[PDB]
């Protein structure tokens, strides 16, 4: 009747242990469409020089996102795309920069709410997938005495549960650049709940596949029921790393989100 | 067909990740593959300012080799500047090395100082375009120049023919690096008994836009390798643009030097 | 008499060595003593330019405490700037600490930022005479100022009344150091539950020529300790000039906080 | 008849594992007499920032001495005092800077000769004292493939054999600043012999005590017989670290060496 097509600025946010590198296929695909794309390493992730033992909360871990959003020009707005654990990075950012966020896109991601503790969807994830196979765990004591659990993701878990259907080159890449990570779950438990005015007001799009072998269909569906997304897009096939196994589909879905939220 | 253990060594500023396509290809043929990050490269936690020479930068290779079980031998494959890591390593562990393979790489010799081919390379390719440079003073007082490779140079000279996903990955994980050229200029020449006795295979393409044809031809003539394999096409990153080809040459090296 | 385990913490630029007279004295009374080098201090192999904050500098203390066997408690004694290491450490391990002792030391509080007493000290003693200063940028972009303490300052202000052998040792092993003051200015204040709950004993002398009487009196009034012991005479390095006296006070602290 | 008194520039050289710090009592004592004193840390010793694994020979280890002697003004000459292993540092230096050396003083030290391999007195030391008690050993591979043995001196050996009669403060100091060390003995074995024109021409004074519990009377006496010192001064009592247990005696002996050799 009147049709609309929009170009947007997407800020792509990796999950813990990973870095900006997992977006290396989706970032050129989005740029083919003319969108602007920023892919950031969070503290102690990718090639960020900080070590995880110097980081004391998931909020401190999120510093690169918040700094980048503090830096945005007046009137610029971004669509934050976060995979796996990064729905927590979107919730943290949205409670500081709601103004700057056109929409949050959850990509096989944790979907925080405002009603329960920030750690709530993490506890639910762990009830759903409690065995992290060959993952190793470590701890350190943070700046106020909390003991923080970190992990080095196991290679079998990487091969079968996160990168199930990815290329051998993509799986070898992962092994070559994967870092330690932490959920800081116990400090999240002590955290103020996400606000309604910030995070609670953001548009929220949930992309997911039922073939995800680590954020399982029962968990994903529980999250959607628990906090209704403004839109849900289920991708057929692929695996947890849909930005690698369904790069073009994900880019076409993200075009639709730009058209709807700019 | 012999299966071999290959130790793949990236160049300065890069990391084990550039071998992400070559490591599975080699493993499809039954080979064992170890891809190492050098100091302050890839995801190694050290920053470049705490490394004081190119031998300290080679530490992950030397520690690996130091620990190789007695009687095992490896084929070290090095790209670009990593021919200098092969020579450092061959001088210390000649008996653990079945052959050195140079992939569009510096090919040091025994007759001139360790920085000779770096001088030659820079003479050949003097403008590193948008690359930025920085300096720090190392622990004995020398000024070390570091660089942050420029994205136009990355796109047109290094990753000329690489996929967009590959070029984009490169920008996502590239680190600062240093040739430590002036410390190489003061370094003892590579020995004849160590580096000089190693079998040497040189892989290149005349389509490389940064180690140019006449510089690579100069190198071959300056220190003739046991075997030279020339790949047609590709770009400087043959392990990305000609992956199966390099894997096939590396199979011939395994067959020949077991 | 209770015997206690004392963890002695030197100040920036120094190392475990300043406690070389105090550690045997304490051990003559049956106490266990651990004297640690902080990052890039004494003979620690790290250089100051790779340390990025005062909490990273405190790493040898925190690792020690992290490993203390369950149920053991220590008395941490800190000189000069090391009151900041006690506060960092008390925030992370309050239950492992029987008491903090401040030996002519900064006494941080919970109400103002972590750099408050450093600002105050510098206001009090602004000219560090022949000290030289240097800067580097840490891994997140902050400019960190380092110093090399000047030998006249070492002789007249720090080691005022020390033996010539002691002053000479000091020159032989002194290292660069940093307050990381601007990073302390950005740091979360010390907590009431951790540092704020620790027992605190302040040892000083009014003959100290660098932490001057009115600055030390200001500190006591700003954050009143559980006990203040004033030693007559000596100089800033009471563990060298009043060794048996400090050992005797430290015995009273062991008796009191077991 | 005519009496002479001379002020000299002494360069004090520590043994492996130790640093310039062991001279902290003798350096003020010599300066009381008006002499000029330089005490240098050798590579990877004291607070020198290099690590022993980056050092490849006893000659490279000696760099701080040779650099300092390269730096001396025309016509200045020094008396090099070396304790324990540092007679090897004096021999290396004398083959580069004979011109700059008024005398070499061996202080319970190895006394190299020109007739045998540079490693010869080390082999003889080890036959004499083969058990280094609680010392730990390690190896690394040097720049041309030689395996180098390093050691961390044991605390009992330190207490009873090197610092036998020293103060508890002096013994605690030692433990607080002691570093790894190496003799590089196998690379010394491969080294050209010290020359007659350089080291062979230097004046040589041997200070020693028969109470030394690590360079034992039979070893010391064998060395004196093997290569006659221009003068020998035996100190009664003390221990291996005569610059700590006999600081003033050693300083008066060193005055006599200044008077005789300037």
A168·B24 Cβ contact <8 A? yes
Helices A120-128 and A217-226: angle between axes, nearest 10 degrees: 150
Q: Tokens 């070390």 label which residue?
A: B144
Q: To probe the interface with B, which of D143, D147, D148, D190 has the most B CB atoms within 10 Å?
A: D143
Reduced to 3 states, what is the DSSP secondary structure of residue C174?
Answer: coil
C164·D46 Cβ contact <8 A? no
- Among candidates B57, B19, B55, which has minimal Cα distance to B173? B19
| DSSP secondary structure code for residue C177 in this structure | B
Q: Which residues in C lie closer than 8 A to residue A42 (C-beta atoms)?
A: none
Please name the residues in contact with A157: beta carbons below 8 A apart, sequence gap of 6 or more.
A132, A133, A134, A135, A214
D231 touches chain C (CB under 8 A): no
The whole-angstrom distance between C93's CA and the closest CA on chain B is 27
Q: Which residues in C lie closer than 8 A to residue D35 (C-beta atoms)?
A: none
CA distance C156 to C162: 10
Residues linked to residue D107 through DSSP beta bridges, in sequence order: D83, D207
Judge whether D105 and D91 are in contact, CB under 8 Å: no
A21 touches chain B (CB under 8 A): yes
In the structure encoding, which two tokens stand for residue A87, read together?
């729905």
- Among candidates B59, B49, B212, B217, which has minimal Cα distance to B136? B49
In the structure encoding, which two tokens stand for residue D188, read together?
């010394």
B66·D141 Cβ contact <8 A? yes
B21·A177 Cβ contact <8 A? no
In the structure encoding, which two tokens stand for residue D64, read together?
């701080």
Q: Which residues in D lie closer than 8 A to residue B66 (C-beta atoms)?
A: 140-141
Q: Tokens 């004979």 label which residue?
A: D98
Q: Find the residue in C nearest to B139 (Cα).
A: C47
Nearest CB to B172 within list A24, A168, A172: A24
3-state helix, strand, coil in chain A (%, to 5): 40, 20, 40
3-state secondary structure labels for all residues of A14-73? CCCCCCHHHHCCHHHHHHHCCCEEEEECCCCCCCCCCCHHHCCCHHHHCHHHHHHHHHCC
Nearest CB to D145 within list B53, B92, B140: B92
Domain ranges in chain A are 1-262
In the structure encoding, which two tokens stand for residue A237, read together?
């096939």
Reduced to 3 states, what is the DSSP secondary structure of residue D148?
Answer: strand
Cα end-to-end span (Å), chain C: 9
Going from the C-alpha of C47 to that of each of A47, C38, D47, the distances in angstroms are 22, 11, 11
The whole-angstrom distance between C50's CA and the closest CA on chain B is 7
Nearest CB to B139 within list C47, C136, C139: C47
Long-range contacts of A214-220 (CB under 8 A, 24+ apart): A214/A129, A214/A157, A214/A161, A214/A162, A214/A240, A215/A84, A215/A108, A215/A109, A215/A110, A215/A125, A215/A128, A215/A129, A215/A240, A216/A128, A216/A129, A218/A128, A219/A124, A219/A125, A219/A128, A219/A129, A220/A108
Judge whether C114 and C190 are in contact, CB under 8 Å: yes
Q: Give the CA count within 13 Å in the CB-facing half-sphere of C102.
A: 29
A147 touches chain C (CB under 8 A): no
Name the resolution in angstroms.
Answer: 2.2
Q: Which residues in B lie closer than 8 A to residue D142 (C-beta atoms)?
A: 92
B47·C50 Cβ contact <8 A? yes
Judge whether C116 and C230 are in contact, CB under 8 Å: no
A47·B43 Cβ contact <8 A? yes
Q: Tokens 């680190």 label which residue?
A: B175
Q: Find the residue in D nearest to C166 (Cα).
A: D24
- Among candidates D74, D61, D68, D67, which has minimal Cα distance to D10? D68
> How would you label A195-233 residue by residue, b for 16+ Cβ within 10 Å and e otherwise?
eeebbbebbbbbbbbebbbbbeeebbebbbeebebebeb
Helix (H) or strand (E) holding D107: strand D101-107
Binding site per annotation, positions of B for acetone: 11, 80-81
Q: How many CB atoms lie within 10 A of CB C224?
A: 12
CA distance B244 to B258: 20
CA distance B203 to B228: 6
D49 touches chain B (CB under 8 A): yes
Tell me, rounded to whole angstroms, the distance of Cα A46 from its chain centroid: 14
| Strand positions, DSSP E, B66-193 | 74-79, 97-103, 132-137, 143-148
- Among candidates D253, D260, D244, D258, which has minimal Cα distance to D84? D244
Query: Mind giving me the DSSP string for A79-148?
Result: EEEEEGGGHHHHHHHHHHHGGGEEEEEEES-----SSS-TTHHHHHHHHHS---TT-EEEEEE-TTS-EE
In the structure encoding, which two tokens stand for residue C178, read together?
């940093």
CA distance A177 to A166: 16
Q: Which residues in C lie closer than 8 A to residue D39 (C-beta atoms)?
A: 172
CA distance B95 to B197: 10
In the structure encoding, which two tokens stand for residue D213, read together?
């519990």
C235 touches chain A (CB under 8 A): no
A15 is in an annotated binding site: yes
Length of chain A: 262
* Best CATH choice for the domain D1-262 from the list 3.40.50.1820, 2.40.110.20, 3.30.70.100, 1.10.10.350: 3.40.50.1820
**DSSP H helical ranges for chain D:** 26-32, 58-61, 63-71, 87-97, 120-128, 155-156, 168-177, 185-189, 217-226, 242-245, 247-261
The whole-angstrom distance between D65's CA and the closest CA on chain B is 14
Interface size, chain A vs chain C, as Cβ–Cβ contacts under 8 Å = 30
Q: Tokens 């004592």 label which residue?
A: D29
The whole-angstrom distance between C75's CA and the closest CA on chain A is 18
- Catalytic pick among D84, D109, D119, D182: D84
Neighbours of chain A (3+ CB pairs under 8 A): B, C
Residues linked to residue D47 through DSSP beta bridges, in sequence order: none
In the structure encoding, which two tokens stand for residue B137, read together?
């003073």
- Among candidates A63, A97, A58, A56, which has minimal Cα distance to A80? A97
B140 touches chain D (CB under 8 A): yes
- Among candidates D252, D144, A4, which has minimal Cα distance to B188? D144
Q: Find the residue in B nearest to D148 (Cα).
A: B92
B23 touches chain A (CB under 8 A): yes
Neighbours of chain B (3+ CB pairs under 8 A): A, C, D
In the structure encoding, which two tokens stand for residue C244, read together?
């048996």
B236 counts as catalytic: yes
Number of helical (H) and strand (E) elements in chain D, helices listed first = 11, 8
Reduced to 3 states, what is the DSSP secondary structure of residue B216?
Answer: helix
- Among candidates B50, B61, B44, B66, which has minimal Cα distance to B6? B61
The whole-angstrom distance between A63's CA and the closest CA on chain B is 18
B9 touches chain A (CB under 8 A): no
Q: Which residues in C lie closer than 8 A to residue D170 (C-beta atoms)?
A: 20
Residues linked to residue A81 through DSSP beta bridges, in sequence order: A12, A105
Q: Give the CA count within 13 Å in the CB-facing half-sphere of B68.
A: 23
The whole-angstrom distance between B193's CA and the closest CA on chain D is 9
Q: To probe the interface with D, which of B64, B92, B191 has the most D CB atoms within 10 Å?
A: B92
B and C adjacent (3 or more CB pairs under 8 angstroms):
yes
The answer for B 120-139 residues in CB contact with A (under 8 A) is none
Q: Which residues in B lie closer than 8 A to residue C40 (C-beta atoms)?
A: none
CA distance B210 to D74: 50
The whole-angstrom distance between D92's CA and the closest CA on chain C is 24
CA distance B38 to B55: 10
Q: Give the CA count within 13 Å in the CB-facing half-sphere of A174.
A: 28
CA distance C8 to C21: 12
Q: Find the residue in D nearest to C27 (Cα).
A: D168
Q: Give the CA count within 13 Å in the CB-facing half-sphere of B166.
A: 22
**DSSP H helical ranges for B41-106:** 54-57, 59-67, 83-93
In the structure encoding, which two tokens stand for residue C49, read together?
């330019």
A55 touches chain B (CB under 8 A): no
CA distance D86 to D11: 12
* Best CATH choice for the domain C1-258 from the list 3.40.50.10070, 3.40.50.2300, 3.40.50.1820, 2.40.40.20: 3.40.50.1820
Q: Which residues in D lie closer than 8 A to residue C174 (C-beta atoms)?
A: 47
Helices B116-124 and B213-222: angle between axes, nearest 10 degrees: 150
Q: Which residues in B lie closer than 8 A to residue D143 (C-beta atoms)?
A: 55, 88, 91-92, 188
């Amino acid at each position: 009747p009147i049709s609309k097509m929009v170009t947007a600025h997407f800020v792509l946010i990796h999950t813990i242990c990973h870095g900006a590198w997992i977006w290396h296929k989706l970032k050129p695909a989005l740029e083919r469409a003319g969108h602007k794309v920023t892919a950031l390493d969070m503290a102690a992730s990718g090639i960020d020089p900080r070590q995880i033992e110097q980081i004391n909360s998931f909020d401190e871990y999120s510093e690169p996102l918040l700094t980048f959003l503090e830096k945005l020009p007046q009137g610029e707005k971004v669509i934050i795309v976060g995979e796996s654990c990064a729905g927590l990075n979107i919730a943290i950012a949205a409670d500081r920069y709601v103004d700057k966020i056109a929409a949050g896109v959850f990509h096989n991601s944790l979907l925080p709410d405002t009603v329960h503790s920030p750690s709530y969807t993490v506890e639910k994830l762990l009830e759903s997938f409690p065995d992290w196979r060959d993952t190793e765990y470590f701890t350190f004591t943070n700046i106020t005495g909390e003991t923080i659990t970190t992990m080095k993701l196991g290679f079998v878990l990487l091969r079968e549960n996160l990168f199930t259907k990815c290329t051998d080159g993509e799986y070898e890449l992962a092994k070559m650049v994967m870092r330690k990570g932490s959920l800081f779950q116990n400090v999240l438990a002590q955290r103020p709940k996400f606000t309604e005015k910030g995070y609670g007001s953001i548009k929220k799009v949930y992309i997911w596949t039922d073939q995800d072998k680590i954020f399982l269909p029962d968990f994903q569906r529980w999250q959607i029921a628990n906090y209704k997304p403004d839109k849900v897009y289920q991708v057929q096939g692929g695996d947890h790393k849909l930005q690698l196994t369904k790069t073009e589909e994900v880019a076409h879905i993200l075009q639709e989100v730009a058209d709807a939220y700019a």
